Design a protein. Structure first.
Lengths: 49, 49, 97
């Protein structure tokens, strides 16, 4: 039951490890470019990315 | 607003520092999640034995 | 009050496990031989079977609180809206110096 819990945590971390590059790219642009604009431009920009 | 090469460069540097900062945190946690599943899947074979 | 504290108190479900887990990995180590009577293995484990449950079910209620939250966060919505509209009305007056 305990070991089953580790298995869930593990698979969860492989998922993140699996979406880190794209997750980072997106978070970077956000920190790099988004700032100047308002919600609408931020929103539309994040969608193009 | 103006976007200059200089922005492109910082963008990349951010992407480089964040991919590291993020992977590191995840791998350091996947490792621990492994020092565990072994110790468990083992005690489970031992006990089942 | 609830929404904060509650979910603001993730530490138990965080550290109380993030290190209490490490404490299981210990017992299992000073083990490999007499596993069946090992109190620190029987302890740490059953300890988790509990300290664990706290999260699971207690969460089953937090989704239902987020619901409490939502219901009420909708009941105020119209008024919050009027407010935004009123303010931007005062801002239109700015056309006159």
């Amino acid at each position: 039951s305990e070991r089953g819990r580790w298995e869930q945590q593990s698979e969860n971390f492989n998922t993140q490890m699996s979406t880190v590059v794209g997750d980072v790219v997106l978070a970077s642009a956000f920190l790099a470019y988004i700032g100047f604009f308002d919600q609408n431009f931020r929103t539309d920009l994040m969608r193009k990315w | 607003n103006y976007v200059t090469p200089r922005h492109y460069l910082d963008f990349i540097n951010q992407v480089v520092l964040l991919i590291n900062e993020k992977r590191d945190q995840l791998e350091e946690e996947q490792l621990h999640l492994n020092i565990g599943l072994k110790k468990l899947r083992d005690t489970e074979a031992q006990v089942k034995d | 009050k609830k929404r904060s504290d509650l979910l603001k108190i993730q530490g138990e479900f965080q550290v109380k496990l993030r290190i209490l887990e490490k404490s299981l990995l210990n017992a299992l180590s000073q083990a490999s031989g007499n596993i069946l009577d090992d109190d620190s293995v029987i302890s740490t484990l059953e300890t988790l079977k509990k300290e664990t449950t706290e999260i699971a079910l207690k969460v089953e209620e937090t989704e239902t609180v987020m619901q409490e939250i939502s219901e009420v966060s909708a009941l105020y919505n119209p008024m919050a809206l009027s407010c935004s509209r009123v303010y931007f009305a005062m801002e239109e007056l700015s056309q006159f110096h």
